[PDB]
Ligand binder design. Structure first.
Ligand SMILES: CC[C@H](C)[C@H](N)C(=O)O
Ligand SMILES: [Fe+2]
Ligand SMILES: [Fe+2]
Ligand SMILES: [Fe+2]
Ligand SMILES: [Fe+2]
Ligand SMILES: [Zn+2]
Ligand SMILES: [Zn+2]
Ligand SMILES: [Zn+2]
Ligand SMILES: [Zn+2]
Lengths: 264, 267
């Protein structure tokens, strides 16, 4: 049953068209010749919101889990093992404790991943976009805010933090690769963006690290589904993964639209 | 909105509340009774171990819960101030040491996995060794928490859903944690049994905490990234001090039962 719940979680991510071969954003990042700065800035504002919300809502869900263990006289060590994994994995976005992030990430609040992203990706591209097109890039499509509303719900769900890590850290690497590809084809005149040695340290360090995160969230012993105590919780976990993965897919497909449209 | 001259007054008053609650080394009775005691009975040592396991278990989880309420408050904001984000990171690193043992002092000694969680590490290496020397009747009696301790556990449960709860708990506990650790090292070296904790690393939980709780105390009271830096306006400054005063009062009453157990020799 433990093994089956894993496999069925993976199938829900398949059906949501999140895998590397099925998602439009992964394709359009690979196939596009150039990327207008307006489009790249629109994706930067959307990712900034989605990854900020991801970090805080997951930490929130981690606290909801904490509040349940305190209601238990002696929580089972296997549930504590997965609890530790949530803390470690989410923490890297907050404190850069992994090897790939401790190297290059800024110190203090500027190393928080959404702050790091807006400082080294969003703003450098924003310098090449007219203010009128910057306000338009800031407007978040309702598929993005729809995902933000889902994260809000999972922020108070007893299994929410596990639903978010299991799904997100399973699509992280292909997102980081799409950014590596797309933010290098941004066509601005005279200057060439992101040509310097560590101009995209955010993206590169996430490529080196998110391989370790996918293993931890899916590890059969300290993985996220080991937070599922009984069968009724396995039903809920699957149901959350289904709706959550559906929101991520529709959110990422707006990135492909921005690339196709060349604007927000 | 808090001016610079206002931030400094909040830090001073927080220190004075903890002083007023008789929690400093010279004032609290537990710290003094642990030093004065010639010998400690296994019964009293086991009651303190049971109360500490409960108090440190609740502390860690409720503080983690409080870390969650803050995360929800930050998500509601479009751009949380980096000064608040800096103290947030501190909350995350200090309380995380009870869970992942990232600090240098726990780096070498702590067990790996769930058994390294400090309340689990505490009961495995301190509680269970002393429990073997206590009659059945007295183990059930040591596991029954006094009113003052359950009063502290309730105060933790209310702060678990308070938007400043984790900052309140960390500000007080990490400030007094070193003295509690020194009290544990003294009394658990004096348990009289027909000897206990004679191996070089039998009290590694305590010794690693004597080193690490020196840092934590400094981190929570830092002027730029400390706990009062999570207080945004004058109303939250009011709630912080009222919370600190009530919380410190409960901690004082709870440690008083530790001193009482050392004097009585039983639970
Ligand atoms: C949404 C999480 C992603 C994969 C990554 N952790 C980040 O810093 O954004
Ligand atoms: Fe990250
Ligand atoms: Fe990650
Ligand atoms: Fe600890
Ligand atoms: Fe500590
Ligand atoms: Zn929905
Ligand atoms: Zn168009
Ligand atoms: Zn009270
Ligand atoms: Zn007596």
């Amino acid at each position: 049953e433990q093994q089956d719940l894993d496999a069925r979680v993976g199938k829900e991510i398949d059906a949501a068209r999140l895998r590397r071969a099925d998602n439009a954003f992964f394709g359009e990042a690979r196939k596009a010749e150039s990327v207008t700065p307006e489009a790249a800035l629109a994706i930067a504002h959307r990712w900034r919101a989605m990854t900020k919300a991801f970090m805080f809502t997951t930490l929130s869900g981690l606290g909801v889990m904490a509040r349940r263990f305190q209601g238990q006289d002696a929580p089972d060590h296997e549930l504590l093992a997965a609890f530790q994994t949530v803390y470690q994995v989410i923490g890297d976005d907050l404190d850069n404790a992994a090897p790939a992030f401790r190297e290059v990430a800024p110190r203090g609040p500027a190393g928080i991943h959404y702050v790091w992203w807006e400082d080294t990706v969003l703003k450098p591209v924003a310098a090449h976009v007219a203010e009128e097109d910057r306000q338009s890039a800031a407007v978040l499509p309702r598929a993005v805010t729809g995902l933000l509303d889902s994260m809000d719900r999972l922020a108070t769900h007893p299994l929410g933090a596990a639903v978010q890590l299991r799904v997100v850290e399973d699509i992280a690497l292909d997102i980081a690769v799409g950014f590596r590809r797309l933010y290098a084809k941004v066509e601005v005149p005279g200057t060439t963006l992101f040509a310097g040695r560590d101009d995209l340290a955010w993206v590169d360090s996430h490529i080196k690290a998110e391989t370790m995160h996918a293993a931890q969230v899916s590890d059969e012993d300290t993985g996220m589904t080991r937070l599922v105590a009984d069968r009724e919780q396995a039903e809920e976990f699957l149901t959350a993964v289904r709706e959550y993965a559906a929101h991520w897919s529709a959110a990422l497909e707006t990135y492909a639209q921005a690339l196709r449209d060349g604007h927000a």
